[PDB]
RNA sequence: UGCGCUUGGCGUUUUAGAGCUAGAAAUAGCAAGUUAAAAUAAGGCUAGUCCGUUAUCAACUUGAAAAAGUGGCACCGAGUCGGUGCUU
C-alpha cells in the first residue's frame, strides 16, 4: 500500500532493497536481486505510481524471461496480495 | 577571463556550470592520459555528478544491538557453565563439550552423539519422561528428591538463556500485573487527557469479561456490553490495540489517511512514533498504559492455572491439549475425510499440520488451512471454537511469549535452587550468584563497558578488574559513567555551541514556546499577556480560542491554538502546590528533575540524582514523581532563552512578555560566536545523504578553479534540494478540508454535487467547492459545468509577487469582476463579499493570509512594507542548512587578508531559492523533462548562475539578502519607490512592482490587462553596465541548454555492507553457498546465499587447462566479495592462487569499482554493475525544442497560464506535430546505436505507427515513457500504451575486456583512458 | 535533523529425540510430530560481558597516515564534442 509497506515487505524477503532520487528528482526504487549486478529499478511516472508498476509487473506471475530472476518474481508476487 | 560558477546540490546529484560575463558556458581542450591514441578531447564546462544516496546509520546500529545481544546472552550461559564446571566434571566429564558440539554432524563430532547422557538409552528415556523441558522444569520444582545435575543445568540454562522481558521494575504486584488494577490505570490516564467527556467504568467486571477464554472480538465487544460509547471510540481502539487486533486511529483523531497499529508487529514502536508526531506527544502516556495492559491479558492466556510453577504447568496443559486434539483430529481425518490425510499430516509443503510442524508455516497460516476443512466436517466442534479463539494445537514456544516477565522465570529458578540447595554445596553457595546472572540488566547510563577501544563506550570503572553481574556494583562507577552519559548523549545548541539544550518537556522551554506563540497574535500587550498565561495556559492545558474569546475577553476585558505548557499541568496534578511552580526561585529545582526524567530510566540512579530533592517533599509525592518519565529533546539552550542579553538589560524570553519581537534576532548577537573539512560537513543540521552532496559540491568547486588556472571565480550561486519530499495523502487532504468547511457552512454542496477526490486535481474544480459554489466577488452563483469560460484570478497579482498556490487564487465569473486597480480587489468588491469571506474563513476554507490579502484595500492597499516583504520571500533562503554550506565556500575561496588585515572577499557566494529558476523556466519557456536524461541538473545549475549573477549586477543594493558577509541591510523606502515610476532613475528608489524577476520581462502584464513595456537593454543607473539583453542573451541561454555534450559522471564507489543475504539456507551439494563458519561446510550444514560484490578485478594470469595440464594466458573479470576483501587486500597473490590462477601480474591487475565506465564502438558506453552484469552508460541529448514540445504536449490541459499565453502554447503543439515523428526518429537511431535492444525496439516502433491517430497528449505522455529504454543506468521495464516492453539486461560482461576504460575525474574534464586491448 | 545506549519474543539452520511393518531397485500401508543444544553476518585483536552492514573515492606519482603533487589560451562549429588560430 504505502510505499514504506512495500520496502518492508521486500526487505523481509531477504532482497536488499535504497529509495533513490527523493529530492526534487524522479523517484525510483532499487531492488538488488542477486547481489551481483542485476538491479530491477522502477522509476516513478506522473501517470503511474511506483506501487502500481510493482503490481503490473509482479501481479500476474513470473514473466518467464530470465533464468536468474525467478525465485524473485515468485517472491515479489506474494506481496501483491 | 572572468567567470562564475553555478551549482545545484542534491541528495544524489550535484550539477555545475561555468558562465562568463556574457552568460555563456565556455569550452576547453583537456589532456587525455593513458595508452590510447586520443591525447586531446574537447569538453564544455558544464556537467553533473550522479552518486548513490548516503545511507542512514540506523541499519548499522540495529545490527550492532543484535551483535551485542548474542554476545552477552552467550556470556550469561558461560557464567553458568564456568560456575558449574568444577564440581560437575565429577558427574560427567563431557557434558558441556557435547553441547557446543551438538550442531556438528556425526562425522565432525568428536564426542558422543547424544547431548544430555551420551548414549541412546538414557536419552530417549528422558524425552519420554519429559517430552518438553517445561515437563522437567516443573518436576525440578515439585519434587524434593535429588535430580541429575545435567538436568539441573538444562532447566536453569533454559530460563537464563531465554529469561524474559524487563518491562516491570520491582516484584509483581496486582497493580502492575493484574487485569483489574491495570485496566483502571488505563481509564485514569485516558480521563486526565479529556475532561468533561471522560468514561467512568464504575460498575464493570473487568477480569471475568476481558480476560475470559473467547475470541479477540467476543471479548472486546463483551467488555463494552457492560459499558453503555461504542467500539469505534478511542477507548474501544485502545482495548482492540491491547487485545491484539489492528485498529485504525484515523477516524478517532481525524487524520489524512489511515494509521493502523498492531502490538504484535515488529513495527509498532515506529508506526506509533509517527502517530505521536501528528496527534502530539501528549498521548504517549495513554498508549503506554495500553501496552502495559496488553501484557497482562496475554499472560492469562498462558498462565491458565496456586503454588508450584504456573507457567510450565500451563505449558504442560498446552502440551496435553495439543495431543488430545491431534488424536481427535487424526481420527476424524482418518475416518471421515480419508483422502488428504497425507496432504495434512505428511505434505510439509501445503501448510498442513506438517507445514505447521516441519515445513515453516506460522500458527495463523495453519489455522487458515484447516478452517475450511474443519467446518466441512462433523464432530469438529470444541475444535473450531478453539481455532477461532487462537488456542488450538499451539506450539509451546510461540510469538506471544514476549509478555512473559522475567520474574516468572525467576520464581521457577529460585524454586529449583531452593529444593536442590541442600543437596549440592555450591548450589547452596551460589544460590545468589546464579540468581543474579538472570536478574541483571546493564543500565542505560552505562551501556558498553569497554576498556578503551570502542567509539561508543563512555563508562568509567571504579576498579580496573573484570566485570560480572555480581561485581558490577563494586567495579562500575555509577556516577562518573552517568555524568559522561549526560555529557555525551546531550547535543548542544547551534546558537550557543557549548551550551547544552533543554528537554522538550522542560518548563522554561514550554514557557518559551508559549510566549513566542502569544506574542504575535492580534485582533497584544504585556499587561495581560501574562494574565492570559496565568488564566488560560496555567490552568487549562488547551486554549481553544473559544476559551480565550469568552473566559478572557468577556469575564475580563470587554464583552463581544497550539502548543502549551504541559509539564506545568503534568507536575501540577502530582504535587498539588501551585505556589511551588509559580515561584521563580525554585526554577533550578524544577529543571533538574525533568532533566533526570529524560535521561535515565534506572531505579537507583533516579534516586541518587533526586535524593537531594528527597527533603522538599517525602514519600507519596516522590514515588509518583519518579514513575513518570519524559522523552524528547528541544532545540534551544537555557543560555539563549534566559542567559544572553543585549545592553535594555533583558534576555530573549524577557522580550517575549514585553516589547515583542519573536525569534528574529537582530538590531546579530546570536551569530557573534578553523577545523578540517571532514568536521565542518559533520556538524551540519542535515541528513547523511545531503552531507555527501555538500562534500562532492566542495570537491567539484576545487577542481573547477584548478581547471581555470587557479583563478578563483567572481561569484558562486548555490541551490539545494529540500530532501524527502516525494497522492492519497494530497487529494484526501483537500477533501478533508473541503468536507469540514462545508459542514461549518452547512450548505449542501456535496449532496447536491458529489465529487470523487481524484477530480480535485482540476485547479478550477477545487476552487469551486472552496467557494461554497459562489463567486469570490459577485453574490451570483457558479456554473459547476461551465468552468471553461470562467477564469481564475490572482489576488495579489504576478506583477508584485509570483505566487501560484491556492491561498492566492480565486474563482470568479471573469477577470474584470475584481475591480479596475492593479492592486488587490478594491473596497467596492470588499464591502459586498467581505461578510461571506469570513463565513469561508471560520470553516478553514480559505486561509487568514488569503483573507488578509483579499481585504487589503480596506487598509489602504499594498503598503510599502508589504512590498518590501515580498522581496524577502523571493530572495532570502530561510533554511539554516543552506547558509552553513555557503559558509564552507566563502571560508574556502576568500581566505586572503590585506596588510590592514581585513578579508578580501574575492568571491561573492550567492544563495538563491529553487523557485526563481523554475519560475524563470516556465516564464520564458525553458521547460524541463527530467525523464529524458540527466542533463537537467546541469541546466538548473547554469540557469542558477545566470539568475544569480544577473540579480547582483542589476540590484547590487540587495547583496545582504543572499550574498554571504556583513553588508548594509537597507530598508523599505531605501529601494521601494513611492508610486508608479516616481524617481525612476532619479533618487535612491528602485522598485515599485516587487517581482524582482520583472527586469527580464519584455512586457509586464498587470491585473486589468494593461501593458507595462520594458526596454531591451537592462542597465543599472548607479553604474550603467548592461545586466541583461532580452534580444541577445535569451538565445545564449537557449544555445547552452541545447548543446549535446554535458559532463555526466557516475561516481564510482566500492560496495560496503553485508556479506550476503541473511537467509540461513538449508544444506545442498553445491559449492555456491557461503560457509556459516570456517568448518560448517554448506554441503552438510547449510549456509548463506548470494554474496554481494565489493568491487571487480581484471585478472591477467595463466591457468591449468586440458587433460595435459598445460598453461594458458587468460584475462578474466573476477568479482571480489565483501567477505573476501579483507584477505585479498592483504595477500592478493596467495589469494588469487587459491582460485587456480598462477603467474599473476600485479602491475596489470585493475581495480574496477561499481559504475566503472567502458566505451566500445560508435561512442556506445557501458557501466560495470558487477563482475557479471553491465549497465547502460550513454545519455540521450534531445535538443531544446523537443523538451519544450514534450512538456507542452504532456500538459496540454494544465498549462497554468493566461488564455493570451495558452493560445500560443496550444497552437505551438498543433503546428508542430512533425516533432512527434522527429522525436521517435532519434530514440530509434539512439537505440539502434548504443542501447542494442532490437527486439524491444521492434514493439515501440510498431506501437507508435498504430497510435498516430490518438490525441496529442496521449503520445507525448507515452513517448516520455519511452526514454526508460534509453536512460542511463540499469535497464527497466515500461509500457508504451498497451504493449508492455520488458527489459533486456546485459549479462555478457565479455565485450568490456577489449575496450577503452575511461578513468574520469569528478568533473569529467580530466580523463585517463586505458585501452584494455593492449593488456595481455 | 542526526547520532548513541538497555532488554525481550519468535524465527532460520545442523544435530539429538532409536521408528515398526509385509516390500528388489519404484513405492504403498501404519505409527509419530508440540523442544533441546549451538550459531545468528566469516571473523579481528588490544581479549574487552570489546569491535566487525554508517561515513569516507576517479587515474597516476609521493606518503604509515593525514595529505601534498600531475593536465596552455583564443575563435568558429555542434549528435555527446569537432574541424579552426595563437604560444612553447
GROMACS .gro file of C-alpha atoms in nm, chain A residues 1-5 8 11-28 30-48 50 53 56-58 62-69 71-73 75, chain B residues 10-13 52-53 55 258 260 267 720-726 914 930-931 936-937 1055 1060-1064 1089-1093 1154-1155 1169-1175 1194-1195 1261 1265 1271 1274-1279 1284 1286-1291:
model
  120
    1UNK     CA    1   0.000   0.000   0.000
    2UNK     CA    2   0.204   0.291   0.130
    3UNK     CA    3   0.546   0.264  -0.034
    4UNK     CA    4   0.706   0.216   0.308
    5UNK     CA    5   0.498  -0.100   0.344
    8UNK     CA    6   0.944  -0.352   0.431
   11UNK     CA    7   1.324  -0.645   0.300
   12UNK     CA    8   1.156  -0.935   0.481
   13UNK     CA    9   1.210  -1.134   0.160
   14UNK     CA   10   1.591  -1.101   0.201
   15UNK     CA   11   1.639  -0.884  -0.107
   16UNK     CA   12   1.847  -0.574  -0.026
   17UNK     CA   13   1.602  -0.309  -0.138
   18UNK     CA   14   1.763   0.235  -0.116
   19UNK     CA   15   1.485   0.465  -0.231
   20UNK     CA   16   1.684   0.689  -0.462
   21UNK     CA   17   1.617   1.035  -0.603
   22UNK     CA   18   1.383   1.150  -0.327
   23UNK     CA   19   1.464   1.521  -0.352
   24UNK     CA   20   1.304   1.711  -0.643
   25UNK     CA   21   1.409   1.436  -0.881
   26UNK     CA   22   1.209   1.147  -1.027
   27UNK     CA   23   1.173   0.888  -0.752
   28UNK     CA   24   1.282   0.528  -0.810
   30UNK     CA   25   1.613  -0.016  -0.650
   31UNK     CA   26   1.572  -0.386  -0.572
   32UNK     CA   27   1.914  -0.555  -0.572
   33UNK     CA   28   1.841  -0.914  -0.668
   34UNK     CA   29   2.135  -1.148  -0.690
   35UNK     CA   30   2.355  -0.913  -0.515
   36UNK     CA   31   2.560  -0.927  -0.837
   37UNK     CA   32   2.481  -0.657  -1.091
   38UNK     CA   33   2.115  -0.738  -1.154
   39UNK     CA   34   1.909  -0.449  -1.014
   40UNK     CA   35   1.540  -0.414  -1.102
   41UNK     CA   36   1.482  -0.041  -1.066
   42UNK     CA   37   1.135   0.109  -1.113
   43UNK     CA   38   1.124   0.486  -1.161
   44UNK     CA   39   0.815   0.691  -1.083
   45UNK     CA   40   0.597   0.834  -1.358
   46UNK     CA   41   0.343   1.114  -1.327
   47UNK     CA   42   0.073   0.881  -1.462
   48UNK     CA   43   0.158   0.552  -1.288
   50UNK     CA   44   0.563   0.328  -0.807
   53UNK     CA   45   0.406  -0.066  -1.154
   56UNK     CA   46   0.157  -0.456  -1.305
   57UNK     CA   47   0.498  -0.629  -1.324
   58UNK     CA   48   0.466  -0.889  -1.045
   62UNK     CA   49   0.694  -1.464  -1.314
   63UNK     CA   50   0.734  -1.308  -1.657
   64UNK     CA   51   0.945  -1.604  -1.780
   65UNK     CA   52   1.215  -1.400  -1.947
   66UNK     CA   53   1.525  -1.486  -1.743
   67UNK     CA   54   1.663  -1.789  -1.561
   68UNK     CA   55   1.836  -1.587  -1.297
   69UNK     CA   56   1.537  -1.394  -1.166
   71UNK     CA   57   1.272  -1.701  -0.710
   72UNK     CA   58   1.223  -1.322  -0.737
   73UNK     CA   59   0.917  -1.269  -0.944
   75UNK     CA   60   0.859  -1.382  -0.409
   91UNK     CA   61   2.101   1.735  -0.418
   92UNK     CA   62   2.095   1.416  -0.213
   93UNK     CA   63   2.225   1.205  -0.503
   94UNK     CA   64   2.328   1.452  -0.776
  133UNK     CA   65   2.425   0.685  -0.483
  134UNK     CA   66   2.249   0.842  -0.186
  136UNK     CA   67   2.264   0.591   0.389
  339UNK     CA   68  -0.511   0.553   0.783
  341UNK     CA   69  -0.309   0.126   1.181
  348UNK     CA   70   0.693  -0.210   1.351
  801UNK     CA   71   1.986   2.299  -0.271
  802UNK     CA   72   1.706   2.044  -0.297
  803UNK     CA   73   1.493   2.017   0.022
  804UNK     CA   74   1.500   1.639   0.059
  805UNK     CA   75   1.238   1.375   0.143
  806UNK     CA   76   0.952   1.539  -0.046
  807UNK     CA   77   0.817   1.252  -0.260
  995UNK     CA   78   1.461   2.689  -0.608
 1011UNK     CA   79   1.360   1.503  -1.623
 1012UNK     CA   80   1.278   1.163  -1.774
 1017UNK     CA   81   1.870   1.899  -1.633
 1018UNK     CA   82   2.088   1.911  -1.321
 1136UNK     CA   83   3.034  -0.155  -0.224
 1141UNK     CA   84   2.546  -1.185   0.160
 1142UNK     CA   85   2.173  -1.243   0.202
 1143UNK     CA   86   2.082  -1.328   0.562
 1144UNK     CA   87   1.879  -1.641   0.479
 1145UNK     CA   88   2.039  -1.929   0.666
 1170UNK     CA   89   2.347  -1.742  -0.034
 1171UNK     CA   90   2.421  -1.469  -0.291
 1172UNK     CA   91   2.725  -1.268  -0.177
 1173UNK     CA   92   2.742  -0.901  -0.268
 1174UNK     CA   93   3.032  -0.779  -0.482
 1235UNK     CA   94   3.082  -0.021  -0.945
 1236UNK     CA   95   2.967   0.208  -1.228
 1250UNK     CA   96   2.745  -0.306  -1.246
 1251UNK     CA   97   2.935  -0.613  -1.123
 1252UNK     CA   98   3.169  -0.886  -1.247
 1253UNK     CA   99   2.886  -1.048  -1.444
 1254UNK     CA  100   2.645  -0.772  -1.544
 1255UNK     CA  101   2.659  -0.428  -1.704
 1256UNK     CA  102   2.457  -0.106  -1.711
 1275UNK     CA  103   0.206   1.645  -2.196
 1276UNK     CA  104   0.050   1.939  -2.009
 1342UNK     CA  105   0.292   1.117  -2.207
 1346UNK     CA  106   0.777   0.662  -2.100
 1352UNK     CA  107   1.809   0.615  -1.996
 1355UNK     CA  108   2.023  -0.033  -1.521
 1356UNK     CA  109   1.755  -0.142  -1.770
 1357UNK     CA  110   1.394  -0.117  -1.657
 1358UNK     CA  111   1.050  -0.208  -1.787
 1359UNK     CA  112   0.793   0.038  -1.918
 1360UNK     CA  113   0.464   0.044  -2.109
 1365UNK     CA  114   0.436  -0.396  -2.228
 1367UNK     CA  115   1.008  -0.584  -2.099
 1368UNK     CA  116   1.370  -0.504  -2.030
 1369UNK     CA  117   1.681  -0.664  -2.182
 1370UNK     CA  118   1.966  -0.667  -1.931
 1371UNK     CA  119   2.337  -0.710  -2.007
 1372UNK     CA  120   2.481  -1.028  -1.854
   0.00000   0.00000   0.00000
